Amino acid sequence: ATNHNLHITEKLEVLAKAYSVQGDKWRALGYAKAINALKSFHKPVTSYQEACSIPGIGKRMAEKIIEILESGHLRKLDHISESVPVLELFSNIWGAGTKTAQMWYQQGFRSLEDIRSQASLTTQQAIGLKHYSDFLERMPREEATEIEQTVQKAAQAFNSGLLCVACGSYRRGKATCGDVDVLITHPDGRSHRGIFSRLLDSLRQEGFLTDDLVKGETKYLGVCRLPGPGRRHRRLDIIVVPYSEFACALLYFTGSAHFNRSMRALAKTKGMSLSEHALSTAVVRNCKVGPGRVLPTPTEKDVFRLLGLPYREPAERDW
DNA sequence: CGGCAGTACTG
DNA sequence: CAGTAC
DNA sequence: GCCG
Ligand code: NA
Numbered sequence A: 001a002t003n004h005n006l007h008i009t010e011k012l013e014v015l016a017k018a019y020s021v022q023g024d025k026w027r028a029l030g031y032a033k034a035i036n037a038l039k040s041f042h043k044p045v046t047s048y049q050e051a052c053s054i055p056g057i058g059k060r061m062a063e064k065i066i067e068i069l070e071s072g073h074l075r076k077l078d079h080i081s082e083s084v085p086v087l088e089l090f091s092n093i094w095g096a097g098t099k100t101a102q103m104w105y106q107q108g109f110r111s112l113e114d115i116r117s118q119a120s121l122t123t124q125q126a127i128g129l130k131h132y133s134d135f136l137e138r139m140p141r142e143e144a145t146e147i148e149q150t151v152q153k154a155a156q157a158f159n160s161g162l163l164c165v166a167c168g169s170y171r172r173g174k175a176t177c178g179d180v181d182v183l184i185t186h187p188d189g190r191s192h193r194g195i196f197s198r199l200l201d202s203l204r205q206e207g208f209l210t211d212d213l214v215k216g217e218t219k220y221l222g223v224c225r226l227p228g229p230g231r232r233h234r235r236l237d238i239i240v241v242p243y244s245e246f247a248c249a250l251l252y253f254t255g256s257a258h259f260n261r262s263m264r265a266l267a268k269t270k271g272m273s274l275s276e277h278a279l280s281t282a283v284v285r286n287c288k289v290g291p292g293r294v295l296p297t298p299t300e301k302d303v304f305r306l307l308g309l310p311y312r313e314p315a316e317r318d319w
Numbered sequence B: 001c002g003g004c005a006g007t008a009c010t011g
Numbered sequence C: 001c002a003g004t005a006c
Numbered sequence D: 001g002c003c004g
Helices: A006-021 A025-039 A048-052 A059-071 A075-079 A084-090 A098-106 A112-118 A123-130 A132-136 A141-156 A196-206 A243-254 A257-269 A300-306
Strands: A163-166 A180-185 A209-215 A219-224 A234-240 A272-274 A279-281
Touching: A006 A025, A006 A059, A006 A075, A006 A084, A006 A098, A025 A059, A025 A257, A048 A059, A059 A075, A084 A098, A112 A123, A123 A132, A123 A209, A132 A234, A141 A163, A141 A180, A141 A196, A141 A234, A180 A243, A196 A209, A196 A219, A196 A234, A234 A243, A243 A257, A243 A300, A257 A272, A279 A300
Parallel strands: A180 A234
Antiparallel strands: A163 A180, A209 A219, A219 A234, A272 A279
16 A cells, blocks of 8 residues: 655656646656555566556556666656746646746746736636645644535525535545535435525625636636635635435546546446536447447446446545 | 546626 | 646 | 557
């Protein structure tokens, strides 16, 4: 359960991160998968041929693994553009991605203070910038509990039947959480409809929601802060789903993102697709001309079973 | 080589 | 539509 | 980046 390849994964991560901020999204993904594969390997990798037998690791990656193995270093790291750390700075701003980080850099911006004054910001980015440090800190698991509970108590005041579950890294049992995701549904047919808009206004007037980032029909991305002195602003999502979708949503929003991805790819090998909504039979084509059949999945286990896969609890889904 | 998810909001 | 994030 |  321990990473026997740490000195190697560290160097790789620096390189992946650089590709990521530069917007080389797919090469960065390739790196991420190789890195997870290395973290879970039963022992320190000791040969180029052993590295190649690992799924997610190919010639080029093995090459870099062995260089670090035998050198201690990765020459490539020495040739990353000086731009990278500023690109990373700017793209740590919620709502700012690689294109915006890049644009700002091309304009000569170099610090958050520059961005704050001299730069043009979307409404989302401004909320991101002003909560920049708060949003970078992981919060104690117990603060995730308070936040989730604040939502649940305000939710159940409208309909005591509503189920609220905190997902993401919280559900996966982490001691600290980067954000909170509160999934809400109702066991009955569908008493989840109608109360969303009212819950948010309640939480807002109450003082809990400080800023809105995205107001969707059934998904809310925003910012909360618990009552009291010295509280930090925390990133918060609320999703409302019909009961039929509870299992898939629970799975998706629990993630992790890497796990979700691997689950989609498996589903694909079995002629299926997996989304936050459903495990479904393949779609009708030409192109793309109709939905697949939805496969009933009351529980997460159902989803794993239908993919011919043993159930893995939330704590075992880092990837 | 192409796919690596599909969508949902904001502007 | 481009960009961003779930 | 990797994989079929
Ligand atoms: Na960001």
